[PDB]
């Protein structure tokens with residue numbers, strides 16, 4: 437009731453906003469190539485006129501989701517991005533060459549498909565996974581509508597390069613999703629795990645093999661366990677920060693599997709760890725912003741990246757505020773699809789701050805307890821999006837961040853990611869979900885975590901024809 441009017445109307449502007457940010461024929465990005473997702477049109481203060489593989493990948497996943505839920509008009513925009521990545525994967529850069537393997541870690545490029553040869557927090561090893569993920573799902577659609585040549589000769593060998601990457605380089609160090617902390621990032625490892633699992637499944641589906649996907653996936657999932665502290669999920673290893681970061685919120689929602697239970701080992705949205713993490717991570721912003729003064733632990737607050745952040749002084753982020761909501765909406769989906777809502781001693785505070793009478797127990801859909809909690813949850817999540825609404829522009833625009841005291845838009849305008857974050861949260865509020873990646877099978881923690889690698893092949897896809 438309280439935001440549907442705005443959500444559905446905003447979601448319309450979000451779709452078109454993304455398309456204006458993708459060349460060659462996007463309104464706000466003249467000079468960009470066909471299928472290059474510019475992160476933001478802003479060309480100074482700040483100059484975001486580039487194309488980040490991460491940003492490109494998270495957006496295209498969202499576009500693939502929509503496309504498969506019946507928005508078939510996205511076909512050319514999605515395709516165009518496939519042909520773009522063909523050229524992009526082969527751009528030799530400060531991080532490396534394509535035949536090397538390294539340099540699929542290259543955080544960003546120019547909009548004309550040329551390397552960025554300036555200093556940058558490189559490499560970031562999330563990108564290759566995040567691309568393969570976005571591509572894989574459109575591969576599945578191609579298969580399940582009989583376009584096998586495009587699925588086998590164009591889509592697979594792009595996804596083969598990125599899979600080859602993740603298996604080889606995962607256990608080596610690199611910079612986080614915020615481009616700041618050199619180490620091992622949770623988000624990075626989470627989204628990398630998903631890629632080899634769903635990439636193995638998809639590579640089997642084109643009459644082929646991803647032998648390296650298989651060996652390493654449990655090893656990454658083995659490593660992943662270590663990020664849990666008991667209290668919450670650590671953002672990065674090798675950091676003097678608290679470890680509370682939106683990083684982890686995003687790791688959950690972008691590895692959310694619908695055919696899956698509240699599994700602590702893959703850190704799903706309804707899992708005790710991610711639930712505890714949401715309590716901890718969101719709390720960490722309560723007092724540090726003047727914008728959130730007089731907003732109790734039952735109500736929602738403007739959410740940032742992390743409390744140690746000093747970038748633009750360190751404000752609330754729209755996509756991060758939208759991530760707080762999205763985990764909760766995936767939680768509400770998974771409790772519905774289960775017919776259960778386990779309160780554990782781990783999660784306890786998460787519920788207790790929203791539902792005063794919350795306590796340790798399993799409570800099915802039928803119970804009084806479930807009904808009261810999911811109202812409180814729905815309201816809490818609805819709370820964040822209401823804050824997103826408030827500081828969103830009159831014509832529906834969203835920036836990267838919004839001021840810490842008074843909430844005005846700050847940093848890069850028309851951030852492509854912000855719109856994708858909106859399109860995703862809104863979807864999950866209306867029970868719209870993405871195809872499973874195979875979590876059911878990939879939940880067993882191994883015996884011992886082996887700091888190892890495995891190798892693939894690396895081969896350059898030419899944009900040959902269109903079958």
Ligand SMILES: *[C@@H]1O[C@H](CO)[C@@H](O[C@@H]2O[C@H](CO)[C@@H](O)[C@H](O)[C@H]2NC(C)=O)[C@H](O)[C@H]1NC(C)=O
Nearest residue numbers: 606607608609619620659662673885886887888
């Ligand atoms: C490479 O992988 C190994 C496990 O395969 C990781 O080892 C863990 O590292 C964390 C953080 O230092 C420790 O708390 C664990 O106790 C380690 N476990 C073991 C068995 O060594 C290692 O951190 C990984 N490193 C990178 C950069 O990926």
Ligand SMILES: *[C@@H]1O[C@H](CO)[C@@H](O)[C@H](O)[C@H]1NC(C)=O
Nearest residue numbers: 449453829831832833849850
């Ligand atoms: C809203 O108007 C501003 C004016 O500069 C524009 O830059 C922004 O892209 C607009 N948003 C739309 C049309 O969604």
Ligand SMILES: *[C@H]1O[C@H](CO)[C@@H](O)[C@H](O)[C@@H]1O
Nearest residue numbers: 589593894895896897898
């Ligand atoms: C490696 O594989 C790629 C993509 O299938 C080809 O373009 C290349 O010629 C080599 O066979």
Ligand SMILES: *[C@H]1O[C@H](CO)[C@@H](O)[C@H](O)[C@@H]1O
Nearest residue numbers: 522523526527534896897
């Ligand atoms: C694969 O890599 C080669 C060498 O960079 C390119 O020429 C080709 O277009 C594709 O990107």
